[PDB]
Symmetry: D3
Subunit: 251 residues, 6 copies
Amino acid sequence: KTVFHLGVTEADLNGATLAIIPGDPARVQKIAELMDNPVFLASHREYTVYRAELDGQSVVVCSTGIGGPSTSIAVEELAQLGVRTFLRVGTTGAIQPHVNVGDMIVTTGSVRLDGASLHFAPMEFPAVPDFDVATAMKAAAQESGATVHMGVTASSDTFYPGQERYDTFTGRVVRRFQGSMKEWQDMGVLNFEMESATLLTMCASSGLKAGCVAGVIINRTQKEIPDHATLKETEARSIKVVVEAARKMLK
Amino acid sequence: TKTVFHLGVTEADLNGATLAIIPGDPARVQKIAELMDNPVFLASHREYTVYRAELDGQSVVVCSTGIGGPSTSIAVEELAQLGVRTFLRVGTTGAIQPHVNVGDMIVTTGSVRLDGASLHFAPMEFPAVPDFDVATAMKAAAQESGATVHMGVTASSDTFYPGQERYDTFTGRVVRRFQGSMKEWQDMGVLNFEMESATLLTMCASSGLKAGCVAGVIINRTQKEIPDHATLKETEARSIKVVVEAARKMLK
Amino acid sequence: TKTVFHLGVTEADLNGATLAIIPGDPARVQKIAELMDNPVFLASHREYTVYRAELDGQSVVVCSTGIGGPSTSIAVEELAQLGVRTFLRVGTTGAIQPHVNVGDMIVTTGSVRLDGASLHFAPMEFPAVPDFDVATAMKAAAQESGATVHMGVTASSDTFYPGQERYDTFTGRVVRRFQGSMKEWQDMGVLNFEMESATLLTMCASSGLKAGCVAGVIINRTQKEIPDHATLKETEARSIKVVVEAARKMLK
Amino acid sequence: KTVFHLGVTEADLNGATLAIIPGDPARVQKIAELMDNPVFLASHREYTVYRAELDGQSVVVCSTGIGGPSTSIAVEELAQLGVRTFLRVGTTGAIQPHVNVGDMIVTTGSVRLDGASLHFAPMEFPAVPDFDVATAMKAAAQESGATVHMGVTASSDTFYPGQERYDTFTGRVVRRFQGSMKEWQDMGVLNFEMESATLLTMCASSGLKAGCVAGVIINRTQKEIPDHATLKETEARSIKVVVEAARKMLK
Amino acid sequence: TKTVFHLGVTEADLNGATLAIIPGDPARVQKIAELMDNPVFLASHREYTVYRAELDGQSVVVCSTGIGGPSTSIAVEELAQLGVRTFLRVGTTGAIQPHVNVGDMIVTTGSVRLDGASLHFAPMEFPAVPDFDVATAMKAAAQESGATVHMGVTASSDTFYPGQERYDTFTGRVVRRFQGSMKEWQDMGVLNFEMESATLLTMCASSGLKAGCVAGVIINRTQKEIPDHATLKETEARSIKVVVEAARKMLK
Amino acid sequence: KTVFHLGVTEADLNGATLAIIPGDPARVQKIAELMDNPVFLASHREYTVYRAELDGQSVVVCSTGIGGPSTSIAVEELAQLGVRTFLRVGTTGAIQPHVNVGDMIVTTGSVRLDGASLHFAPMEFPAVPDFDVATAMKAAAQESGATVHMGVTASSDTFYPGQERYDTFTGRVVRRFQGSMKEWQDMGVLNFEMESATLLTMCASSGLKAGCVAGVIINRTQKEIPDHATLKETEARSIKVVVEAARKMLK
Ligand SMILES: Nc1ccnc(=O)[nH]1
Ligand SMILES: Nc1ccnc(=O)[nH]1
Ligand SMILES: Nc1ccnc(=O)[nH]1
Ligand SMILES: Nc1ccnc(=O)[nH]1
Ligand SMILES: Nc1ccnc(=O)[nH]1
Ligand SMILES: Nc1ccnc(=O)[nH]1
Ligand SMILES: [Cl-]
Ligand SMILES: [Cl-]
Ligand SMILES: [Mg+2]
Ligand SMILES: [Mg+2]
Ligand SMILES: [Mg+2]
Ligand SMILES: [Mg+2]
Ligand SMILES: [Mg+2]
Ligand SMILES: [Mg+2]
Ligand SMILES: [Mg+2]
Ligand code: NA
Ligand code: NA
Ligand code: NA
């Protein structure tokens, strides 16, 4: 059995029912090498796929690319090949003053500022994680020594106007998004990223377990350019955490 | 010193309470209060019956909401004006999944916003989700009771009849929006219908208040067989014992 | 035959009534019923208190709705199942036009649908409008009482607080949708805010039921946000006199 | 001094504060001639304008054309010239089986299946007549001896798909409108026409008094295209009614 | 053999025409027809004046639409019933960009759907775009006339006044939706406002009909100068010369 | 200057003001090698960037990844670095029986079944190409000897439910998209892809020139699995066409 984009077969996954799904293809090997017997399976487009073993059980690691549309393809095709649980790891920009660079966030629900979520459920449906996955992610994050925040994430189909960035080619933000960062701040929203609304809505409406954990790389109330050593430490911690969360899900 | 407009209570009446248990039915308020220590009647106006009690030495409010988001929104707002920050919704519910049995408990992880009042706090994109600590406490209390507990999505409707795709009605009509909707939600894994959680969860999650919802299952629309009086009585009693234990877990 | 699910009454209990007066507050049910002949208590459950009475020799029902469209929709549906076809709503309201005074009466000619339950009966395009006969009877009854009467559009909100653009609240915030909305409605000639007419009028106008709404003004929102208590009793008393006389005109 | 489209001045109206607004420019003179001293004022595009006198008071008669957009121009420009009350007469298709050709409908509210109404008020706002105008129209219609219905009207920006007609070039109706006639019928809606949502919303949100009376020329439970044999008498009856309603509105 | 309900013409009346030129103003119909061979008046009913003529030996229809999408939609449908497949809209227009000068021509490449009738043919997601051959023919005809031609997006409004963000009106009010909208469109590069293209282009593009729009600019919302009478006369004449030449290119 | 995702500077582009933007990073080198002096600039995530020279002028080639979100980042960042004209090439699935595998499509407008377009303009705004770019693409495609179709494209945030595919993990399509392929077919829509609505809306509302040309790899009325030699030939012709369209756009 084959799929249209990922370039892997059911047999290639060696019975895996859990996937770790970072955004960046270059991070796939970095996650896989935290586990046993990592093996490269395929690379096509933004999709790099490895298998590995965790406590004797097969796990797949597959990049999503940026955004809900490319994420939706990876999740669907992995589900066709038997995957049922999806652990998203990535980076994020915090919007609350009390959330520091280097902290971790586990999303309890997403503001659906995307389009692909609507291809699975109407807007009324909540973009919420599986409770076991969120619970595992919180525990793994705390156990790493991180400062961890549970809360709502704004999930945008753009990096620029949908996150109310003005330092752009046009310097304009469409009416819908003018004032939106302050609005989300006042509503207690923690952070922005670009895939969770799609992932969580798709999975919660399709009988798949999903959750999202992220390391804070910037705070929008502070500066846009991360410090390199701090960012490296955050990224390394994030992938250690997601692997430990996977271990908890497989127990 | 103010007395809130609908609930008819003052901040002093609450004796420092920062947590409320919020059932729908005014007649259930005294029953819940009497599970705790030193229950005291505070007021009854309209659908709002208000008691205070003590739980491990700390003051707790019990306040009914009435049916629906609009009346719930008033109770939550007025209690928040008087210092309440945590809201635990309890009740009983039907279920729409064949695997969910009478006597099981549901703790809502998110709600389908089939209401109107949620939109008065946040646009539709915003998730109707509980506070994680409250949901965690509710799951623990429910599981410790010995019940089978389901974590998942609840469809929260502004109507009992067409928004829950009921056809046994005066007109027998369901508007286009809701035709086929029960099967749609079933296929999406939604556990149950109720009528307040979308408003409650959206209001609180967007206003700096902690909220969650737990419910005992008293009927299942997919199932033919009828539950006996004993099982229903036990389920109602367990639901309120569970919410009180969840309140205990929330106390600091 | 059947007992309806929430109201706890049967068709036989209504003694042939085809008209209901539907106040919000359960405590006001007896007060309306006693303005008519042979009032009898039928049932009380949750926010629903139900009496029967007789008006010019014809049976009438008085049934509270609770606050908001969701609880109203249940009462209207269940009364319609038992043969009620005409629904007269009485309540209180906040005026938003400077010339409308406390104690005046408003008869709604159409409602701004700032609710959710109306959408469970008809899409947003559908007008939340009263039955013309009911509105005509309410105008006449209100005028014949010596009241100052206004006919016009009502903004009907699922919340008391943000959807009526109140800021003296726990968060002190109003969601984008509702920021500037009071001024917008004022400029459009809207008379008043309340919380049930959009649901009631849309439900009934799309379901073969006759409905209308009359309300007593208890606050002018150009003046302040929270209603005064000193003028509320007199306003409430005249309102219920008016609705009973409107019912008499409908039974003729 | 002279409004942009209608080609008349305030002085031309001789103090009129009430207008009768039929759709067809050819019916303007007919309505004006039911009153005293009719005077032709202007004709441009779909806008033919007369004045006349009714019980000694100046009245305007001004055609609207078909649809909310052209209606909105006429109402605005008449309002700029001092008109405050607008009485709309036209033809309509009934959708209830009991409503017959030649009956008269007075709209109590309109289903807003237009676009121009949204240029005055958001969709939540009711497309409702002024109560005094509706009262006058009911009284005039009933006093005439006509069979009169009060109720909801579906007001469509199209004659064809928005009234769920299939005897058309494509023979198709967009998803929104598929099954719509039966839905409106089940909801008790009386009839279809094409201007009331715009007129009533515009006026109710702008401090103008408006209402609509219509003569039934077809029953849509019977067929799609109106029979010609009964057009003339229905139209004649309708305009006598609207003139009597105008008489009732004069102060 | 039928006579269409509004236009009052039969298929035989059109003498095989498969292309129509569709101005807004009935008085412009004869003026366009006389640029062609053997013009003949067919009918005038309401805002619909219909002529036939011959262009390079092929029959052409000229039919006015009236103002707005609703009346336009009737004319297009009824002509399509009688075999017309290509529709060329002409007129004159204002502009909202400083670089678009009086006497210039605009050929619409897409329309902002600020109408209602387009939604009766396709949901809002669908693009209001012309047939590429028609747009290409219109550009060429416009260039060949010596005019400066602009290709771009047109904002197509169901109103002349608030939907074009005009405040010089009876109320002086523009609903929230349209407040700030002219600057919004200007900053997005939109060239002009008119009142029929969104309906026409959406209807035709979703119905297997070829359509496009060309216009003369009669006002610029950004220039204080008042255009000279001769310039306006020249522009009107040029616009209809251009649309006839575009029809010639479509028939070749 | 520098950008957040693409890893290139303005200097790296050597004055280029036109970009060719395929979806698949592997296609970038292929396109660049059709031109003179191709130079690899960077590869990060789904973004591979080359420069080349066409008739002596610098051209950039930059992949977008799948979907509007990742496309929107590339377009913004290239615009920050001076690019003003964007020529999209890719593959597509036809939905019309008369549009054969191997044909080419030049989009005249897109059905906005995405989310990112709404981050630039409200839904009313048309997802429309620049007329010069569309003209150049039609000319290049026809001059190649291809069979070329001009028309409307449905641009979806998903490959699966938003293109009404049922051979999936759940086998379900959300109500919004049930019956949608037939609806688009009846409306004359030619094809499905996943980036044009975002690209065209973004550019048309931001002062950037854009257009889209695509080779038909599948017909949804036929089979899902393409024949390899046919697909190879279609892909090769598509990139030759887009380079010739670029030549036509140079000033
Ligand atoms: N600010 C941001 C940092 C990382 N990812 C985002 O989507 N946004
Ligand atoms: N079926 C239901 C039982 C209880 N509450 C509801 O809202 N629905
Ligand atoms: N201001 C108000 C008074 C009474 N009822 C309302 O809903 N609002
Ligand atoms: N059926 C109809 C007759 C007259 N006017 C309409 O809009 N519809
Ligand atoms: N400003 C305008 C001139 C002509 N037509 C319009 O619709 N708008
Ligand atoms: N069927 C398809 C082929 C290629 N791309 C798409 O989005 N769809
Ligand atoms: Cl007051
Ligand atoms: Cl008939
Ligand atoms: Mg700090
Ligand atoms: Mg800090
Ligand atoms: Mg704002
Ligand atoms: Mg009491
Ligand atoms: Mg919170
Ligand atoms: Mg405060
Ligand atoms: Mg073939
Ligand atoms: Na991507
Ligand atoms: Na209630
Ligand atoms: Na017209």
